[PDB]
Design a binder for this molecule. Structure first.
Ligand SMILES: CN(C)C(=O)Cn1ncc2ccccc21
Lengths: 179, 245
């Protein structure tokens, strides 16, 4: 089992902390959803290769430009997250998070991940966003942003229902193993 | 971590730590407030435990088993004793507040109503000055510590055997040398998230809502001062590289 390192980046509202929690427990918490994630080493077997994938969050580091890059050394794969119920989080991907990740993690694969895909057809979500002349992110808008920023791939998931969460982390492991 | 504290913080939440008959006596908003305070104390207990792995397992083991050059162990673990002193004292105060709150005849049923004042004390005066001075130094030596560890692991056979030996047990899975350094760096930026969620469920008593509002501002002031006092030290960097920064 080789050791690989994953770091998730994105705005505070993208749901990155919840995604790391639901993956590490293989369960959306039924009693208490933790405010914070410390770290985790997941045992993953992808395509017959065994890997120990260390998981890290950047939540709470968004306003601190000198503390935040301390999470980046020796990273093997970046998960760049946005929320599908938040077009503003997708707008921040190409000129805030992408230049930073490419500077501190050169040649490290980036997977653009659209979180909260369960809210794309949520009526309360559609009514609230319509007030600010907005709508949930379309699948093609996510694919085009991933293509534009030079992402390794584009994926979607829902931490609430667990759909697509395992696939994201198995693909991150595959990306971390590439030359 | 001592067994008494581990058992007290073994449950996933405060609602699962207390007796179900004691839980039933509280309103929904108090259970939500207590679940977040329990998360803050339990993660502080884990943070202090991370600092003890660095001081007792790693640092002390290298001094008593290996023959490294002078100033190498200090370079690997900068400010670990000072950090351990700040957080063991803060953990002591948090656990003492939980202990005083316990019902007579019980070692698990408690409600903490007055956390704000303790947080204002930790993030103001001399203790905030020491946290700022210590994190500003530690975070500025982060990259030098990681590069020194990699050189030692790759070139020293006895150091590599030592690391492989002490990190082999399953309880050390998340706690290698580099993982411990990032766990500590990331700790301070977890406080605003926890304090803000505690504040969200502390409107019942105006004085408590005000004390947590003051505590949140003091934590953010501290983080801004630490962030502004960081410059990565580099072994071998010349003065010219430094003043042309
Ligand atoms: C001209 N410079 C300094 C850069 O292009 C490097 N860069 N890019 C993003 C970023 C964030 C923090 C620090 C330096 C960063």
């Amino acid at each position: 089992a080789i050791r690989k390192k994953l770091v998730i980046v994105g705005d505070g509202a993208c749901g990155k902390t919840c995604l790391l929690i639901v993956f590490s427990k293989d369960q959306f918490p039924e009693v208490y959803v933790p405010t914070v994630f410390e770290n985790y080493v997941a045992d993953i077997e992808v395509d017959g290769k065994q890997v120990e994938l260390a998981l890290w969050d950047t939540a709470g580091q968004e306003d601190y430009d000198r503390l935040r890059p301390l999470s980046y050394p020796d990273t093997d794969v970046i998960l760049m997250c946005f929320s599908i119920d938040s077009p503003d989080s997708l707008e921040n991907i190409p000129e805030k998070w992408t230049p930073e990740v490419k500077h501190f993690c050169p040649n490290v694969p980036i997977i653009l991940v659209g979180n909260k895909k369960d809210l794309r057809n949520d009526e309360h979500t559609r009514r609230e966003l319509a007030k600010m002349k907005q709508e949930p992110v379309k699948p093609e808008e996510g694919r085009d942003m991933a293509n534009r920023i030079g992402a390794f791939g584009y994926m979607e998931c829902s931490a609430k229902t667990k759909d697509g969460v395992r696939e994201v982390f198995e693909m991150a492991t595959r990306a971390a193993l590439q030359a | 971590s001592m067994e008494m504290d581990e058992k007290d913080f073994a449950a996933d939440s405060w609602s699962l730590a207390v007796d179900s008959s004691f839980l039933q006596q509280h309103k929904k908003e108090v259970m939500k407030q207590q679940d977040v305070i329990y998360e803050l104390i339990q993660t502080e207990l884990h943070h202090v435990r991370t600092l003890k792995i660095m001081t007792r397992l790693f640092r002390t083991g290298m001094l008593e088993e290996l023959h490294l050059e002078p100033g190498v162990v200090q370079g690997l673990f900068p400010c670990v004793d000072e950090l351990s002193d700040i957080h063991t004292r803060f953990l002591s105060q948090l656990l003492e507040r939980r202990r005083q709150a316990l019902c007579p005849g019980s070692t698990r049923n408690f409600v903490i109503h007055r956390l704000g004042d303790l947080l204002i004390s930790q993030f103001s005066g001399p203790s905030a000055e020491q946290m700022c001075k210590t994190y500003s130094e530690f975070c500025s030596r982060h990259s030098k510590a990681l590069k020194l560890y990699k050189e030692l692991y790759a070139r020293d056979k006895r150091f590599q055997q030592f690391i492989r030996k002490v990190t082999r047990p399953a309880v050390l899975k998340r706690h290698g040398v580099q993982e411990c350094i990032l766990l500590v760096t990331q700790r301070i930026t977890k406080y605003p998230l926890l304090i803000s969620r505690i504040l969200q469920h502390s409107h019942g008593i105006e004085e408590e809502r005000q004390d947590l509002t003051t505590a949140l501002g003091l934590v953010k002031e501290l983080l801004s001062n630490v962030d502004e006092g960081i410059y990565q030290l580099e072994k071998g960097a010349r003065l010219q590289e430094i003043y042309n920064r």
